[PDB]
């Protein structure tokens, strides 16, 4: 019928584990789990045996880059945003003890980099 709405990283519906397909007018329990802001709501197969709108239900928070490297050199591999990663390179031939590569992840109401603080071995 619905042919399984799809896998949503945001949410792990209770019923979807062994069932996956439902009749029109059926409400599914979706929960936003790993820190996403969104207000969970059921997805109901209302249109064309397709779901009401499971899209962007749970939300990613915008990330930041004002912590800056001491040298002034930081590289944006993926982006500044959530799931993205950056380099903190002070020098080519030096070591950075802590988070050389900061990664922005969801804490729940905000997104932070896993960066402890700028570090330069030199």
From Swiss-Prot:
It comes from the Eukaryota. Coiled coil: none annotated. Glycans are attached at residue 15. It is found in: Membrane. The modification Pyrrolidone carboxylic acid is found at residue 1. Disulfide bonds join 2-45, 32-58, 63-104, 90-120. Residues 1-60, 61-122 form the Sushi domain. Present on erythrocytes, a subset of T cells, mature B cells, follicular dendritic cells, monocytes and granulocytes. Belongs to the receptors of complement activation (RCA) family. Membrane immune adherence receptor that plays a critical role in the capture and clearance of complement-opsonized pathogens by erythrocytes and monocytes/macrophages. Mediates the binding by these cells of particles and immune complexes that have activated complement to eliminate them from the circulation. Also acts in the inhibition of spontaneous complement activation by impairing the formation and function of the alternative and classical pathway C3/C5 convertases, and by serving as a cofactor for the cleavage by factor I of C3b to iC3b, C3c and C3d,g, and of C4b to C4c and C4d. (Microbial infection) Acts as a receptor for Epstein-Barr virus. Interacts (via Sushi 1 and Sushi 2 domains) with complement factor C4b. Interacts (via Sushi 8 and Sushi 9 domains) with complement factor C3b. Interacts (via Sushi 24 and Sushi 25 domains) with MBL2. Interacts with FCN2. Interacts (via Sushi 24 and Sushi 25 domains) with C1QA. Interacts with CR2. This is Complement receptor type 1. It comes from Homo sapiens. The lineage of its organism: Eukaryota, Metazoa, Chordata, Craniata, Vertebrata. The gene is CR1. The chain holds residues 42 to 163 of 2039 of the full protein.
């Amino acid at each position: 019928q619905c042919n399984a709405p799809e896998w949503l990283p945001f949410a792990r519906p209770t019923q979807l584990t062994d069932e996956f397909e439902f009749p029109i007018g059926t409400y599914l329990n979706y929960e936003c789990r790993p820190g996403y802001s969104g207000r969970p709501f059921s997805i109901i197969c209302l249109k064309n045996s397709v779901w009401t709108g499971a899209k962007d239900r749970c939300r990613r928070k915008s990330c930041r880059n004002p912590p800056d490297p001491v040298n002034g050199m930081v590289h944006v591999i993926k982006g500044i945003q959530f799931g993205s990663q950056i380099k903190y390179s002070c020098t080519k031939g030096y070591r950075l003890i802590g988070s050389s590569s900061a990664t922005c992840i969801i804490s729940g109401d905000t997104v932070i980099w896993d960066q402890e603080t700028p570090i330069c071995d030199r």
